[model samples]
Target: MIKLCREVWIEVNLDAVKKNLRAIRRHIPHKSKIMAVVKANGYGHGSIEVARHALEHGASELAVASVEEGIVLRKAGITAPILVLGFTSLSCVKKSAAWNITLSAFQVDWMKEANEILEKEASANRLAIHINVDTGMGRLGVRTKEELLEVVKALKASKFLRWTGIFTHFSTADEPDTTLTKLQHEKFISFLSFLKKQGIELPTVHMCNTAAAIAFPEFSADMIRLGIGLYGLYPSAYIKQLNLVKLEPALSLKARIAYVKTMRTEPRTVSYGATYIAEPNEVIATLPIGYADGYSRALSNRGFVLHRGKRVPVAGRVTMDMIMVSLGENGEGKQGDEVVIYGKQKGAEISVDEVAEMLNTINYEVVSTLSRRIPRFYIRDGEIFK
Candidate 1:
């Protein structure tokens, strides 16, 4: 949070990620490995950075959502088993096969086309495929056991395609009531059994995501895709109450106080449209963080930032590149003083979830919304050498 000479930056506690993965490993079965999901840029904690720490901890494979995301990792020298959880376009299938990135498979015709493309290109490596069994959620994947069989059989028929794994996702895993989640798992298990009946077996099978992995570790069959959890955020408040594993949040959003002034006069309105009026003699400070920095405009006049261990209220409408905060009359604030946006400040703290609540969103969005323009400094082993 000190002078990086940056207007606003993010501090990623890399050690927290390693610690979170280790604690998660302790709760899950020893046989079950981790597929660190680093999609959405590791939920906006910098994918390559978070991936490295997680891999070093307990992850045997990595999970990304797109071909480009996988390509970014591969280009960064991460040769681990990276599975694309989202749909990989036929346009990028050749790249996927060539890079040895696993594609999530569902449609048989798409696979046939991919096979033709790989064969035509004369690729040296067979394209790895993980058939997604869409038990619920109704997004992408085989909707039924028959559809899954068709996908598996299609892969077997293709010389260029290799059926590497099969997996599913739960829609209600975070809900307190387990009835719907249990049904989803039941459907997943039924599909697996049906595949067994057809004498088709896949080596790697996974179904448990973060919430399910913690609540129902038995579902962590071959691997668990640790996404939000690996970054040290709880899947849900329900999961947090469960306390299956203690999670330390890894990211801290902070910025330096750009300017500060004591308001001796009254009726000092601030920012766009003059949404806020300054209290008499209030100390107002300008921060180089705004909606453009992923600090949403909705937080105008509503959010709090830590200044000198005291809560400073957002002064007015958050601008595109700047925001003003009002320090109380007696508050001591200085230019270039470190201000905590959402993290520990002195002994006081404002959690990411608290910001999420203020935004009426989730903690995932709170961190992930922080744009790439803000440089990220990493803290590994309690130090930000990187």
Candidate 2:
């Protein structure tokens, strides 16, 4: 919804997203549902647009990390079942219920407080809650079976709160090793068995995350929360080696060369700190993207981009709004030439995974941290939608 007049922007391929969703659904059974995790602004790929693509393809429901995220989608007129995977503050319980959004409940005390608020609000809407069990990850969930049972018991006794689903998260599902994963799965099974023994059967249950969905299809109990994989990126590099399914990248970061000039200095230092020096007669080009645009300064003098089918090296310290690239001899790139920051070029490409490796981080961080200030262009049917 912002201006796209800037030369730098991120392009999202909606068709690629749809294809990835189809590939993921093929691995999932009909009995199991798919909940597209569109949190973190759809991993910084544009939440509302990605959610539409997922739901139109095969996702049965949508998941967000907070109540406000779900409200964003609702405001966009999306009518799919939205589940908040994280805690919903008591302050927004009424608004969540009013929007018919589901919230994840981990502690019994939270439910009790929310129920009290519901009683006072006296709205006709009921609060749909999905109980989170701490099988592993240990981030947010009921840690013990006792606490899990207590949560269910409290939910059953509540006037406005209703338990609709139960789920867990796997910490090492994409680590190439299944030892810890199986152990966590067993713990979850035991917890569910205890629930059944207590005569409390939940309407829906799920555990398989994106990693588990690809590596262990059997773990798809009732539903799977598809996260990074929905955007055509693997949860981990190891998961990509499994050959479970083909994934087409749906996002690309690109920019146009703003200026170009021939250097005539005797290896003059460039940018702040003089971290780099340019060779005599070397052609230099400035791109209108820098750390402020999510192109990390850590990539200073270490990152490379595609220019005219050749790899152009960063020539100086990355600035806040600009970066200098060295177009060595034979490089005839000029102003207005397209540069691939992290995507395909004429005959070369700079992948997000490669950028992550250079940064010693995961691919998730690379795309999810792309600054919102950069305009996002959605492409479908080989044409820009907006």
Candidate 3:
């Protein structure tokens, strides 16, 4: 029964997660597997916890960005299949095999190293692979059809690996219009056909991420990777512009007012940097949270927080350990009023998307960058029906 001393807590809702997963499932192919991308520490929603929630619901496989993340998930007792989405150094090729993790292979040297490591183990198919094609991402993968064919051929020749599937990432699938996405899908599908004609039969083929999974289901080949959206957020700004719906926000950052004090507001300067000036008599609530705690300093004067079921404008500079909030004419609260940094409230709410908008960034960076010092509280088995 450890208490949160500072009164700052992050609330994670499992209900929102179920709703988001259901929404994502609606667009994927029935036969294809749903692999929720649980990388970036589950988008800073606690990877170990959210990964379990995702697999329990319907995710067939968990996908991570690095070998270390796969090992972390494995160490957490995650027995579900995992695919490492990004590259692994030649040194860690066996680390994938030891953890029963599948690595996405694109280069011949990586495959060669993986085979050398697998020969020392008993399993002929010690590590599995999914080959990625550049198609257009231009980030990581085979850049040309020739390179794609060569990698596929090389993997087939390896005794220690199974070429389980083929995959590519969409850079613009969530665009305002799906024109470029359609073209990329067409190219990817054509590549698959070309492979088929060359006597290669890939058991699993996938290309769409969360954005494409929601907005364009036709591209959900044999599997789709659901990521940020699965945690109850949109893939990008254009998805909303294109009229997508049914996503929920699963996280809420909350804190209790450590103390409240009255202030002589007339002709007085505000807190740090003298950034804010009081209009009239004002009340200020102080909370022990700041940029060092992952609350962006950009939110100093531009952000709003929920307190006592009302919206309070943040004032002056947000220090590393606290922030001064302006409680205007309608504001009143005691020492422990609930202060919401994000998520819904009775009459006022502060949304992560709104904060990202103020910071000129996306929700991914804003939410995932939240440091782990803030304790997370999870709500389970509590429902509206109850």
- What number of clashing residue pairs does each candidate have, in the order they appear? 0, 0, 0
* Residue 343 lDDT in candidate 1: 89
Error of 1 at 375 (Å): 0.8
Please give the CA lDDT of all the candidate structures: 0.83, 0.85, 0.79
Candidate 1 lDDT over 1-386, as tens digits, reads 24566568888898778788889889998998888888898898899888887777778998877888888898888878988877767888877777888888789899889999988878889888888777888998888777777777888899988877887889989988999898988888877787788776567888888899989998888888888887788878998998668988888888888888877765577777977777767788888888888888888778899888878788879889888887778668678788888889878999988888877888888877788889888987677754
| TM-score between model 3 and native | 0.92
All candidates: TM-score: 0.96, 0.95, 0.92
- Say what the RMSD of model 2 is: 2.0
| Model 1 stretches astray by more than 4 angstroms | 1-6, 265-267
Mind giving the per-residue lDDT tens digits that candidate 3 earns over 1-386? Answer: 32666777787888889888887776566877788888888898888878888888988898888888888888878898888887778787666677788888789777776787777766644677888888778888887677778777778788878777778888887777667777777788778788789777777888877777777787677888888888888867778666655888889887888877666545567787787876545677788899998988887787788776777788899899898888875457888777778888887777788888888888899888888888877766763210
lDDT for residue 25 in candidate 2, whole number 0-100: 81
Q: Which candidate leads the pack in lDDT?
A: 2
